[PDB]
Amino acid sequence: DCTSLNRLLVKRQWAEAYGEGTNRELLGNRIWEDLFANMPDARGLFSRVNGNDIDSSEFQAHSLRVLGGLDMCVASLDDVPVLNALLARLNSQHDSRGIPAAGYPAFVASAISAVRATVGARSFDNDAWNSCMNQIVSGISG
Amino acid sequence: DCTSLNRLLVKRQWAEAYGEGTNRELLGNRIWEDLFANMPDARGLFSRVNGNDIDSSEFQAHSLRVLGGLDMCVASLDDVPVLNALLARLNSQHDSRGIPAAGYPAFVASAISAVRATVGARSFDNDAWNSCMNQIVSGISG
Amino acid sequence: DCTSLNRLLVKRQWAEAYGEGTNRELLGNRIWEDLFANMPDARGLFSRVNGNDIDSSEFQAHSLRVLGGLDMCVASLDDVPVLNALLARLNSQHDSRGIPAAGYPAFVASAISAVRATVGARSFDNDAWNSCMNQIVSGISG
Amino acid sequence: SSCCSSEDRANVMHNWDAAWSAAYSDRRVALAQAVFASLFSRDAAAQGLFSGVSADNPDSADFRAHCVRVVNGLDVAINMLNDPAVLNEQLAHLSAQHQARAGVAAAHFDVMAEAFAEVMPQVSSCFSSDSWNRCFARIANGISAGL
Amino acid sequence: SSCCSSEDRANVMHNWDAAWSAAYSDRRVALAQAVFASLFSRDAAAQGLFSGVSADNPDSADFRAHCVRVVNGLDVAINMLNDPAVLNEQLAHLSAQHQARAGVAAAHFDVMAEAFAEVMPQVSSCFSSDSWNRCFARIANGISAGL
Amino acid sequence: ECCSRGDAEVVISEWDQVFNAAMAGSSESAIGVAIFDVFFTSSGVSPSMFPGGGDSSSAEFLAQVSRVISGADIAINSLTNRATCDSLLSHLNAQHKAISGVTGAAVTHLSEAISSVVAQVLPSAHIDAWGYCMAYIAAGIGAGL
Amino acid sequence: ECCSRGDAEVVISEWDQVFNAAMAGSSESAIGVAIFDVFFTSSGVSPSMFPGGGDSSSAEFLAQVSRVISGADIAINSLTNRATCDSLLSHLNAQHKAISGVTGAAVTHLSEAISSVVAQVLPSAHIDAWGYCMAYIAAGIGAGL
Amino acid sequence: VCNRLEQILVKTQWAQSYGEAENRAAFSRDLFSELFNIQGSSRALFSGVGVDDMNSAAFTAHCLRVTGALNRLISQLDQQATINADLAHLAGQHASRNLDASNFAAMGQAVMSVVPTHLDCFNQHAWGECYERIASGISG
Amino acid sequence: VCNRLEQILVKTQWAQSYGEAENRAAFSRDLFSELFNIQGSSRALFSGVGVDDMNSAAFTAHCLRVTGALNRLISQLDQQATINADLAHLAGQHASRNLDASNFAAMGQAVMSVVPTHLDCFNQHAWGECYERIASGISG
Amino acid sequence: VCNRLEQILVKTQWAQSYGEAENRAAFSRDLFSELFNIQGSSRALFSGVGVDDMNSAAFTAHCLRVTGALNRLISQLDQQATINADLAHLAGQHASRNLDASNFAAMGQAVMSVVPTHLDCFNQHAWGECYERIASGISG
Amino acid sequence: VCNRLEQILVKTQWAQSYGEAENRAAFSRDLFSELFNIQGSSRALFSGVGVDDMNSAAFTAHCLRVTGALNRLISQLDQQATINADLAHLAGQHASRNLDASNFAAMGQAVMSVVPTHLDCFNQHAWGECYERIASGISG
Numbered sequence A, B, C: 001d002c003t004s005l006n007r008l009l010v011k012r013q014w015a016e017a018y019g020e021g022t023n024r025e026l027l028g029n030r031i032w033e034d035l036f037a038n039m040p041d042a043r044g045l046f047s048r049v050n051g052n053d054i055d056s057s058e059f060q061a062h063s064l065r066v067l068g069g070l071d072m073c074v075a076s077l078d079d080v081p082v083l084n085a086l087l088a089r090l091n092s093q094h095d096s097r098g099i100p101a102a103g104y105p106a107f108v109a110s111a112i113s114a115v116r117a118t119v120g121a122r123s124f125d126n127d128a129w130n131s132c133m134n135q136i137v138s139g140i141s142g
Numbered sequence D, E: 001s002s003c004c005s006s007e008d009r010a011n012v013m014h015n016w017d018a019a020w021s022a023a024y025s026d027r028r029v030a031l032a033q034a035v036f037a038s039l040f041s042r043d044a045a046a047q048g049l050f051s052g053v054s055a056d057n058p059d060s061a062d063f064r065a066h067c068v069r070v071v072n073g074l075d076v077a078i079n080m081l082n083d084p085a086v087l088n089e090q091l092a093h094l095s096a097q098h099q100a101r102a103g104v105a106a107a108h109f110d111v112m113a114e115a116f117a118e119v120m121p122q123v124s125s126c127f128s129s130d131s132w133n134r135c136f137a138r139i140a141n142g143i144s145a146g147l
Numbered sequence F, G: 001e002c003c004s005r006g007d008a009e010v011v012i013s014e015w016d017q018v019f020n021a022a023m024a025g026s027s028e029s030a031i032g033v034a035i036f037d038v039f040f041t042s043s044g045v046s047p048s049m050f051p052g053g054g055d056s057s058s059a060e061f062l063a064q065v066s067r068v069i070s071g072a073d074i075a076i077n078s079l080t081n082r083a084t085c086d087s088l089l090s091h092l093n094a095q096h097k098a099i100s101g102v103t104g105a106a107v108t109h110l111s112e113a114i115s116s117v118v119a120q121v122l123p124s125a126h127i128d129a130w131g132y133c134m135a136y137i138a139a140g141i142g143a144g145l
Numbered sequence H, I, J, K: 001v002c003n004r005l006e007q008i009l010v011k012t013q014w015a016q017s018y019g020e021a022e023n024r025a026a027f028s029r030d031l032f033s034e035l036f037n038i039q040g041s042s043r044a045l046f047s048g049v050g051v052d053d054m055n056s057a058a059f060t061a062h063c064l065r066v067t068g069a070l071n072r073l074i075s076q077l078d079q080q081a082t083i084n085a086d087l088a089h090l091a092g093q094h095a096s097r098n099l100d101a102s103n104f105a106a107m108g109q110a111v112m113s114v115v116p117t118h119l120d121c122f123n124q125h126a127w128g129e130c131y132e133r134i135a136s137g138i139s140g
């Protein structure tokens, strides 16, 4: 249940974790390092953006494009009509790329884990994060 | 060999790592995150205390009950007669719950790892920790 | 390609990560904990230096001998004639010990990961590190 | 009711932990035994509820462990005072455990309070009775709810 | 050309993020819609390039998302100003995307610049036009390269 | 004391982190409506008692919600100055004595709805401090009701 | 401004971290030779123009490389005092007006070779600050060329 | 009056200026001190809320209800229908008070005097627009 | 407009706000930054004094001549005949510039935006009166 | 003269003493101030680089080229063939200047006077050896 | 006398009061300074350990042996049989010294005078009980 209160909490904590400037790369690195560690085959999906070297300028630009799109969706969590249109466009950037369905719940788990690591686990609301993140990826995959 | 000197060292470092107030949750989280990562099936053993969300108030109360019992045993390491009675009672809270034997050495490894991470690895006495922790869980399991 | 510029970068960052005094043990621990986690069987290769307890004085002396030899090779990266002689001698300390070939790329990945963790991932040059580290271990193994 | 303020709990948690810490030896048993000795002295009928722990042989390993187990239960709760959402789940837990023990009544917690109020001043270098009383009630009232 | 100095980008990044942060609600759409309203007001022909996003019904979910998507693109670039090696890879990326859109010309970025220059002063509590102009050009010139 | 300076300070900081003028009116209404939903459920009070009848789509009800929340906002921000806070609470008391149907129990239910929704949007809330301070505010507003 | 105090400060710190007298002469020559290799490739300038003919084994060329790099070193370290830096650049300008074959474009290519090699040996370099400050230095040295 | 962009500037600057806790009380008493200094005749209008001692609990409470109302209105500046309804409510409360245009103008000037002294950045144009939007709604 | 008492309040607050030395230059550039932010169209009017780079010596110099003039006018606010003659001189200098009422209104709002951010006390009423007195004299 | 070990001591101490950025300019002007104080006749030799005002951009620039050259020579003290070629280049540049032994001795003493005042540790023996190595190469 | 709970309070307060290192020496000299100030006749009893100069190494050493003994006794206050044996040993050492009740009373008062001045919390009742427990054991 990504409730109206849940959405505001997620927006607040996401902005805190994502941050400004290079702090966004700190969050991105936590996400990709975790994802690639858990799902080794996922790295190959990024061969065109140098997924073999996540510290390269090429992969970092990719990483920030991805977190930028997640940021854009999170920011619009309390504006569903616009969010649905954003998700629809993001879906066009992923369909027919052969991305394994499993990659999405894995990315969700890595993103949530990275935010939690950044803002602190005490009192962290996993139901709000999982339910809202799921609403976002469910519009992107398939 | 959990010697008389070993016991005093363990008591001292445990108190340092466990700490006061919410710092006890920091130690608990290190332990459960490690345990569940290494032994995924262990999480299900805690379905009744919401093991699926270790950050929930319900799981945190469980976590602190567990560390409270470990604290109580560690504090009594130099008082064997009383310790044996404490272990006997703890055993009654675990027998016939279908807890896999493997869960205990796994928990020992996670607890020790968490304390070491908290107080510092340099000069850390693993023989004292393993031998004293083993004397404690060996009275709880089976 | 371990280029002349790459060599200077690696020398600089290695010295920063390895450091002085006990900070060398911090780097060593990051390396062995990672290596043993990824390649469990590798620990047994160190039974003679108490690989079962990496915090013991015995293993720490071993660890620092190893990092001392790596330091010596890195420091000589820009002096190839001398480096080749150093690698040749190191090879004599490893041949016919039954060390699995896989142990070396694993150690390289752990060392690089530990240095990166120590100095910071942003702008980290993985090509320089991998290519120069590979030139070093390729003279030690086999 | 009284209120266990932010300042009250900070004071209670610090001083309590300074006495109960696992770092020290022999203090837990002395303190916990004194609490039970006081309890039984105040409510003669109270001892009956502790037949399953050899209450008539105070120095037995069994009675000592009982005293230590009960009091560590208070330690666990006192240290949750900086995360009340968790303390509330714990108190509910403790409440259900006591509701399941024939004879345990709400009035018994008042006598237990009395026992701690008598003992703490004697063993805690720095001790503040009002903060203790208010924070102990915040905890005890959560446990005795139901009985 | 002008130069987007170390001081310029620090100022721009801080103030921009204070308005665009995901923490707030309803500000992104208002700001992005105002930028596009200004753009279309300045270059009547410009709207034609945005036929695929329902530009004639500004309050549609589709147009709003378009405005927000485009402007978040600027957010992404502005926040890369403290890691230009990455910004250069990103601008190249953006450049190739625009080169692939029939009609998009370099001159359009000047009108877009104009739109942001008109809108930012109205919504950013603290705003410095020169720093903005110089850092926006550093970014825009990287995207419009090729067209 | 009940709602000590320490309790008051953390409650004010957390409240202002959730409710402040820089936030979007839609977000403040979402949180206010959530508080009223929890209030209506725990108190059994009829929504028809309020202008706009409890309809979250009614601009009269959202403005009514804004006023009630603002009343709590002013009382909360004045918690470190008891003389001023008591006066604010007294004015609110008089106003509710003049509204038929407002009971002390209801006032308490709404004050607890405020605490519980704050904890939902800010899980790290110091909930005991919230309880004690909202109890103080509720006692003042509902005095004699 | 172009090459602000802030840009200058970070550029000087990074440069001095790469080039300073405590370093081995062989390392300074390796980095200088790398800059000349990138310069020769982007500028098309003939190595025969320099003493030692661009041969990295020639002690005349390495000393020539040391002089050019030192010229950049002095200009870079003087970036926070524009009056002094302008004077240094003016002297360099005069010297190059007297050398046949030095074009403004070439000067720019060498200045960019400096920035690009620094970024290779120090990947965390503030490359926009480098570009702007080296552009300032290049404009002064190549004025009228 | 008071467009979507100006609303954001005003909401941000008000929140920063007004502050939290006791700072709100000092700010509010200052606002009324300036109101009375700008328009001496307005003071008597507050005889019912202990205005003889502006540091009294009674008067401070009144000042906080007023700035508290400004706070809730600015919080809803971006929700037209909601703020319009709230402004109508306030107009109803001020209707019998026998106030006039100069009273609201003086209050506006008091706001323009106090707010910026607690800020590093202040946009008086956006504030003139949005204060008018508010006063207009209350004067009726 | 701008009576003997208001003149004193304004003179005192301007002197404190405007400051000395380089603080005057920062204040002056800020004034024009706010003017341009409030009225975007006014910027092009300054194409002749290096407005493309507001930190340039040329533009800073222009800003200082303007605030310097405000300074000398406020210094003479209490000498009617003298300031009237000086305002007539300035009107003569602005006559051919093709300025309009909104330009002076925007400048007024820029002044009301910058001045108070450098003060603990600001009386916007007295400032509105005295700024009008000045603008009125220059607009002609 | 100036052996492999002394080279390391000198390179390290020079880098620390000379510093970075503007500290280099102050250090360099100080070096020449001491040179002139030690040998008054040397000043006129610099009439072509604005020596009449030692704080001028022109003279500071000259001082920096000189210490900058010392810097590049010390940077190559451990590369015999390279520094020998660079010293020959410098000798060629000083050949027509009509300098003598005392001028280089005075410069040496100026270096020995300034360098240690910016250090906690200074080895004058190693410095006498390596300065001689350098001066020798330039005097020809 | 000196029950299990009082022992804990005293052990904790003594450890904090007495401190470590040189603070122990200052504390100990202070204890004897107070003893002599409270009972002037006791000073001569220490003629054999350089009491004429209380800052001497000899006298400081004596003071430390005494507080050091108090330290070891308090460390064992919770081990009845052990402390009883240690107190008997000390009684044997003081037996021939010709001391009396007033000497131990004065020492007790000296302890009650110095200890609390190095503490934020001091329980004089628990200390009177436990000091008596100790003195009693030594007086014989």
Ligand code: HEM
Pocket: A042, A045, A046, A048, A049, A062, A065, A066, A067, A069, A070, A073, A090, A093, A094, A097, A099, A103, A104, A107, A136, A137, A140
């Ligand atoms: C909320 C989650 C996600 C968001 C918002 C997101 C967003 C994006 C964006 C904005 C781009 C850049 C497209 C462009 O401009 O060319 C992109 C590219 C890509 N994404 Fe995602 N993504 C998400 C999750 C995932 C997951 C889970 C995977 C795979 C396991 C994935 C795989 C890719 C691939 C393969 C590319 C193309 C890389 C390339 O440029 O070659 N994405 N994504």
Ligand code: HEM
Pocket: B042, B045, B046, B048, B049, B062, B065, B066, B067, B069, B070, B073, B090, B093, B094, B097, B099, B103, B104, B107, B136, B137, B140
């Ligand atoms: C030194 C080690 C341990 C100590 C001291 C300890 C202590 C405790 C305590 C005090 C409780 C709370 C009982 C209650 O009041 O209801 C508990 C519950 C429990 N423990 Fe342990 N425990 C330890 C290790 C383990 C391990 C290794 C496992 C499983 C892999 C485990 C599984 C459980 C389960 C399943 C519960 C019940 C959860 C529930 O309430 O539903 N424990 N333990």
Ligand code: HEM
Pocket: C042, C045, C046, C048, C049, C062, C065, C066, C067, C069, C070, C073, C090, C093, C094, C097, C099, C103, C104, C107, C136, C137, C140
């Ligand atoms: C760059 C990489 C490495 C360097 C420089 C290095 C260096 C050294 C040095 C200096 C010693 C101490 C020899 C002595 O004095 O007795 C040593 C011992 C040893 N090394 Fe390596 N080593 C490296 C990698 C590895 C790897 C990857 C493995 C196995 C996976 C390995 C396994 C061992 C073993 C088994 C010993 C003997 C331990 C003993 O004393 O019993 N080394 N190495």
Ligand code: HEM
Pocket: D046, D049, D050, D052, D053, D066, D069, D070, D071, D072, D073, D074, D077, D094, D097, D098, D101, D104, D105, D108, D109, D110, D112, D139, D140, D143
């Ligand atoms: C705030 C104070 C108290 C706390 C924290 C507390 C907690 C505990 C704990 C942790 C145990 C050990 C067994 C278990 O794991 O559940 C226990 C057992 C028990 N408690 Fe309490 N308790 C408190 C007060 C009381 C009072 C007031 C009474 C009645 C006089 C009481 C009656 C009992 C009894 C009868 C047992 C079982 C003894 C046995 O093991 O056979 N408790 N309590």
Ligand code: HEM
Pocket: E046, E049, E050, E052, E053, E066, E069, E070, E071, E072, E073, E074, E077, E094, E097, E098, E101, E104, E105, E108, E109, E110, E112, E139, E140, E143
């Ligand atoms: C610095 C300013 C700009 C940035 C950061 C930017 C970035 C973007 C982004 C991120 C998108 C969304 C689609 C995608 O993922 O690629 C987009 C689409 C587009 N942009 Fe830009 N843009 C800028 C300026 C302009 C200008 C000046 C024009 C021309 C008037 C233009 C023309 C378009 C068009 C026609 C589309 C496609 C609309 C569609 O989705 O059908 N952009 N831009």
Ligand code: HEM
Pocket: F045, F049, F050, F051, F067, F068, F069, F070, F071, F072, F092, F095, F096, F099, F101, F102, F103, F106, F107, F108, F110, F111, F138, F141
């Ligand atoms: C925490 C508790 C409460 C606070 C802070 C509070 C505050 C307020 C405030 C500030 C107003 C607006 C007064 C004005 O018009 O200026 C108001 C109005 C009102 N309140 Fe409350 N209130 C609380 C509890 C309640 C409860 C429990 C009820 C219902 C049982 C209630 C019923 C009303 C009604 C019906 C009005 C509208 C009066 C009207 O507009 O005619 N309030 N309240």
Ligand code: HEM
Pocket: G045, G049, G050, G051, G067, G068, G069, G070, G071, G072, G092, G095, G096, G099, G101, G102, G103, G106, G107, G108, G110, G111, G138, G141
């Ligand atoms: C960043 C740009 C440059 C800097 C800082 C620089 C600096 C210098 C310096 C300091 C010297 C030594 C002067 C002396 O003898 O005392 C020099 C010499 C020289 N430079 Fe440049 N230079 C630059 C660019 C260029 C370019 C682009 C060319 C070629 C197209 C060039 C050609 C030469 C030559 C041929 C000499 C040797 C003159 C001789 O020894 O006869 N320089 N330069």
Ligand code: HEM
Pocket: H042, H045, H046, H047, H048, H049, H065, H066, H069, H070, H090, H093, H094, H097, H099, H103, H104, H105, H107, H134, H135, H138
């Ligand atoms: C434009 C902004 C204004 C706002 C937001 C505002 C707000 C308020 C509020 C919330 C109350 C308290 C109502 C209650 O709970 O009884 C009030 C009362 C009052 N207001 Fe205003 N007001 C404004 C303008 C003015 C002006 C311009 C004046 C006169 C100079 C004025 C005169 C009064 C008076 C006399 C009372 C009644 C005091 C009493 O109870 O004796 N207000 N106002």
Ligand code: HEM
Pocket: I042, I045, I046, I047, I048, I049, I065, I066, I069, I070, I090, I093, I094, I097, I099, I103, I104, I105, I107, I134, I135, I138
């Ligand atoms: C009300 C306060 C004002 C004062 C005291 C003032 C003062 C001045 C002064 C002293 C100069 C310099 C004259 C010279 O030495 O050449 C000047 C020039 C100028 N002023 Fe004003 N001014 C005011 C209002 C305005 C306004 C409202 C505008 C337009 C928005 C404006 C536009 C100009 C322009 C365009 C110039 C000529 C710049 C140039 O030389 O290119 N002034 N003013």
Ligand code: HEM
Pocket: J042, J045, J046, J047, J048, J049, J065, J066, J069, J070, J090, J093, J094, J097, J099, J103, J104, J105, J107, J134, J135, J138
């Ligand atoms: C031993 C260390 C010395 C070094 C490294 C050195 C270095 C230099 C350098 C790099 C230049 C600038 C060449 C150019 O770009 O035109 C220069 C110029 C000059 N040097 Fe030296 N020098 C040294 C010793 C001396 C001494 C001992 C004197 C006289 C007391 C001297 C007198 C001059 C003069 C007169 C000029 C020419 C100034 C002009 O252009 O008018 N130098 N030197």
Ligand code: HEM
Pocket: K042, K045, K046, K047, K048, K049, K065, K066, K069, K070, K090, K093, K094, K097, K099, K103, K104, K105, K107, K134, K135, K138
């Ligand atoms: C009640 C606490 C006391 C303790 C723990 C204590 C402890 C000691 C110790 C450890 C020594 C040193 C024995 C040695 O190594 O030779 C000593 C010596 C002595 N004590 Fe005490 N003492 C106490 C009370 C007193 C009192 C009350 C007096 C007299 C006012 C006293 C008079 C002496 C004298 C005269 C010596 C011998 C000094 C010498 O060697 O000349 N003591 N005591």
